[PDB]
Amino acid sequence: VLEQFLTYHGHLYLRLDGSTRVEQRQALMERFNADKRIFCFILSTRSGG
DNA sequence: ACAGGATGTATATATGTGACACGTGCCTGGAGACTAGGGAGTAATCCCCTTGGCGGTTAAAACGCGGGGGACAGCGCGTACGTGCGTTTAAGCGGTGCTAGAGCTGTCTACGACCAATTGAGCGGCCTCGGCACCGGGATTCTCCAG
Protein backbone atom coordinates (compact mmCIF):
# COMPACT_ATOMS: atom_id res chain seq x y z
CA VAL A 1 0.00 0.00 0.00
CA LEU A 2 2.97 2.34 0.51
CA GLU A 3 3.94 1.81 -3.14
CA GLN A 4 0.29 2.16 -4.19
CA PHE A 5 0.33 5.55 -2.46
CA LEU A 6 3.70 6.69 -3.82
CA THR A 7 2.60 5.82 -7.37
CA TYR A 8 -0.53 7.99 -7.18
CA HIS A 9 1.84 10.90 -6.49
CA GLY A 10 4.50 9.81 -9.00
CA HIS A 11 7.59 9.08 -6.89
CA LEU A 12 10.44 6.86 -8.20
CA TYR A 13 11.46 4.08 -5.76
CA LEU A 14 13.34 0.76 -5.28
CA ARG A 15 11.68 -1.44 -2.68
CA LEU A 16 13.66 -3.79 -0.43
CA ASP A 17 12.27 -6.73 1.54
CA GLY A 18 13.58 -9.79 3.33
CA SER A 19 12.32 -11.92 0.44
CA THR A 20 14.80 -10.19 -1.89
CA ARG A 21 18.06 -11.99 -2.62
CA VAL A 22 21.27 -10.59 -1.14
CA GLU A 23 22.46 -10.15 -4.73
CA GLN A 24 19.36 -8.11 -5.57
CA ARG A 25 19.75 -6.18 -2.32
CA GLN A 26 23.33 -5.18 -3.16
CA ALA A 27 22.38 -4.34 -6.75
CA LEU A 28 19.52 -2.10 -5.58
CA MET A 29 21.81 -0.41 -3.05
CA GLU A 30 24.45 0.30 -5.70
CA ARG A 31 21.87 1.54 -8.21
CA PHE A 32 20.20 3.82 -5.65
CA ASN A 33 23.31 5.38 -4.09
CA ALA A 34 24.53 6.16 -7.63
CA ASP A 35 21.40 7.21 -9.56
CA LYS A 36 19.99 10.56 -8.41
CA ARG A 37 16.59 10.07 -10.08
CA ILE A 38 15.24 7.62 -7.49
CA PHE A 39 13.58 9.67 -4.76
CA CYS A 40 12.56 6.89 -2.35
CA PHE A 41 14.14 3.66 -1.13
CA ILE A 42 11.32 1.78 0.66
CA LEU A 43 12.73 -0.97 2.88
CA SER A 44 11.93 -2.90 6.04
CA THR A 45 13.19 -1.78 9.45
CA ARG A 46 14.60 -5.11 10.69
CA SER A 47 16.08 -6.27 7.38
CA GLY A 48 19.80 -6.95 6.93
CA GLY A 49 21.42 -4.81 9.60
C1' DA B 1 -62.41 -103.51 -36.10
C1' DC B 2 -64.59 -103.69 -31.33
C1' DA B 3 -66.15 -104.46 -26.53
C1' DG B 4 -64.34 -105.10 -22.35
C1' DG B 5 -60.63 -106.33 -18.89
C1' DA B 6 -55.79 -105.21 -16.93
C1' DT B 7 -52.99 -102.19 -15.58
C1' DG B 8 -51.27 -96.15 -14.40
C1' DT B 9 -51.80 -91.72 -13.07
C1' DA B 10 -52.64 -87.40 -12.02
C1' DT B 11 -56.43 -85.96 -8.86
C1' DA B 12 -58.72 -85.13 -4.46
C1' DT B 13 -59.15 -86.36 0.52
C1' DA B 14 -57.87 -87.57 5.38
C1' DT B 15 -53.93 -87.87 8.10
C1' DG B 16 -48.39 -86.28 10.13
C1' DT B 17 -44.69 -81.82 11.89
C1' DG B 18 -44.00 -77.11 13.01
C1' DA B 19 -44.59 -72.92 14.44
C1' DC B 20 -47.45 -69.36 16.07
C1' DA B 21 -50.85 -67.87 19.59
C1' DC B 22 -53.08 -68.85 24.28
C1' DG B 23 -53.40 -69.91 28.82
C1' DT B 24 -51.65 -70.47 33.79
C1' DG B 25 -48.38 -69.69 37.81
C1' DC B 26 -43.91 -67.95 40.13
C1' DC B 27 -40.09 -65.46 39.80
C1' DT B 28 -38.34 -60.88 38.79
C1' DG B 29 -39.70 -55.84 38.50
C1' DG B 30 -41.85 -52.60 40.38
C1' DA B 31 -42.96 -49.74 44.16
C1' DG B 32 -41.63 -47.37 48.62
C1' DA B 33 -38.88 -45.46 52.69
C1' DC B 34 -34.03 -44.36 54.59
C1' DT B 35 -28.89 -43.16 54.31
C1' DA B 36 -24.86 -42.23 52.59
C1' DG B 37 -21.24 -40.80 48.76
C1' DG B 38 -20.79 -39.47 44.73
C1' DG B 39 -20.70 -36.05 41.84
C1' DA B 40 -21.79 -31.37 40.43
C1' DG B 41 -20.42 -26.77 40.95
C1' DT B 42 -17.74 -22.75 41.90
C1' DA B 43 -13.39 -21.03 43.51
C1' DA B 44 -8.40 -21.03 43.57
C1' DT B 45 -3.53 -22.25 41.83
C1' DC B 46 0.34 -23.18 38.35
C1' DC B 47 1.66 -23.87 34.46
C1' DC B 48 4.35 -22.02 30.64
C1' DC B 49 2.47 -20.85 27.09
C1' DT B 50 0.20 -17.41 23.75
C1' DT B 51 -0.04 -14.76 17.87
C1' DG B 52 1.22 -11.78 13.71
C1' DG B 53 3.99 -10.36 10.97
C1' DC B 54 8.50 -10.78 9.38
C1' DG B 55 13.78 -11.36 8.67
C1' DG B 56 17.40 -15.01 8.28
C1' DT B 57 19.78 -19.56 7.22
C1' DT B 58 20.48 -24.20 6.45
C1' DA B 59 19.36 -28.57 4.92
C1' DA B 60 15.07 -31.63 3.24
C1' DA B 61 12.48 -31.36 -0.83
C1' DA B 62 11.73 -30.39 -5.21
C1' DC B 63 13.20 -30.97 -9.92
C1' DG B 64 16.08 -32.49 -14.38
C1' DC B 65 18.00 -36.14 -16.77
C1' DG B 66 20.02 -39.85 -18.22
C1' DG B 67 19.50 -44.63 -18.67
C1' DG B 68 19.17 -49.15 -17.41
C1' DG B 69 16.97 -53.13 -16.04
C1' DG B 70 12.50 -54.35 -14.99
C1' DA B 71 7.31 -54.67 -16.02
C1' DC B 72 4.57 -56.56 -19.66
C1' DA B 73 2.80 -58.99 -23.26
C1' DG B 74 3.44 -62.75 -26.94
C1' DC B 75 4.94 -67.64 -28.00
C1' DG B 76 5.19 -71.96 -27.06
C1' DC B 77 4.56 -76.12 -24.94
C1' DG B 78 3.98 -79.62 -21.75
C1' DT B 79 2.16 -80.98 -17.74
C1' DA B 80 -2.02 -81.15 -15.34
C1' DC B 81 -6.50 -80.21 -13.77
C1' DG B 82 -11.41 -80.77 -14.81
C1' DT B 83 -14.55 -83.64 -17.12
C1' DG B 84 -17.32 -88.06 -17.36
C1' DC B 85 -17.81 -92.84 -15.70
C1' DG B 86 -18.05 -97.02 -13.76
C1' DT B 87 -17.24 -98.81 -9.14
C1' DT B 88 -17.71 -99.41 -3.94
C1' DT B 89 -17.27 -97.16 0.03
C1' DA B 90 -19.33 -95.47 3.89
C1' DA B 91 -22.21 -91.52 5.30
C1' DG B 92 -26.69 -91.19 7.35
C1' DC B 93 -31.37 -91.67 8.43
C1' DG B 94 -33.80 -94.48 11.71
C1' DG B 95 -33.86 -97.48 15.05
C1' DT B 96 -32.69 -99.65 19.67
C1' DG B 97 -30.75 -99.51 24.15
C1' DC B 98 -27.39 -98.63 28.41
C1' DT B 99 -25.05 -95.31 31.37
C1' DA B 100 -22.17 -91.44 32.47
C1' DG B 101 -22.86 -87.33 33.95
C1' DA B 102 -25.30 -82.73 33.70
C1' DG B 103 -28.24 -80.45 36.42
C1' DC B 104 -30.01 -79.79 40.45
C1' DT B 105 -31.12 -79.33 45.73
C1' DG B 106 -29.68 -78.84 50.03
C1' DT B 107 -26.24 -77.84 53.97
C1' DC B 108 -22.89 -75.63 56.08
C1' DT B 109 -18.63 -74.23 56.74
C1' DA B 110 -14.22 -71.58 55.62
C1' DC B 111 -13.73 -67.56 53.28
C1' DG B 112 -13.99 -63.29 51.99
C1' DA B 113 -15.42 -58.60 53.25
C1' DC B 114 -15.12 -54.50 55.87
C1' DC B 115 -12.53 -51.96 59.52
C1' DA B 116 -9.98 -49.69 62.67
C1' DA B 117 -5.92 -49.53 64.02
C1' DT B 118 -0.82 -49.44 62.57
C1' DT B 119 3.38 -48.43 59.87
C1' DG B 120 6.74 -49.15 56.28
C1' DA B 121 6.81 -49.29 51.46
C1' DG B 122 6.93 -46.32 47.87
C1' DC B 123 6.75 -41.93 45.80
C1' DG B 124 8.56 -37.48 44.84
C1' DG B 125 12.63 -34.37 45.33
C1' DC B 126 17.37 -33.42 44.65
C1' DC B 127 22.52 -34.71 43.36
C1' DT B 128 25.88 -37.00 41.05
C1' DC B 129 28.40 -38.89 37.50
C1' DG B 130 29.24 -43.18 34.46
C1' DG B 131 27.47 -44.25 30.09
C1' DC B 132 25.98 -43.65 25.59
C1' DA B 133 26.53 -40.32 21.72
C1' DC B 134 29.50 -38.12 18.61
C1' DC B 135 34.71 -36.82 16.72
C1' DG B 136 38.52 -38.27 14.70
C1' DG B 137 40.92 -40.80 12.63
C1' DG B 138 42.59 -45.23 10.59
C1' DA B 139 42.36 -49.07 8.67
C1' DT B 140 39.13 -52.48 6.24
C1' DT B 141 35.43 -53.84 2.98
C1' DC B 142 32.21 -53.77 -0.36
C1' DT B 143 30.88 -51.80 -5.29
C1' DC B 144 32.16 -51.04 -10.01
C1' DC B 145 34.40 -50.87 -13.91
C1' DA B 146 37.91 -52.23 -16.68
C1' DG B 147 40.07 -54.99 -18.44
Nearest nucleotide by C1' position to the A18 CA atom: B55
Q: Which long-range contacts (CB under 8 A, 24 or more apart) does A30-39 make?
A: A37/A12, A38/A12, A38/A13, A38/A14, A39/A11, A39/A12, A39/A13
Task: Report yes or no: A17 and A44 within 8 Å, Cβ to Cβ.
Answer: yes
The runs of H, that is alpha helices, within A1-49 are: 2-9, 22-32
Between CA A40 and CA A30 the distance in angstroms is 14
Spatial neighbors of A36 by CB under 8 A, at least 6 apart, are none
Chain centroid to CA A7: how far? 13
Experimental method: cryo-EM
| Protein-proximal positions, strand B, CB < 7 A | 54-57
SS3 A9: helix
A19 CA from B42 C1′ (Å): 52
Alpha-carbon distances of A20 from A4, A8, A23, A28, rounded to whole Å: 19, 24, 8, 10
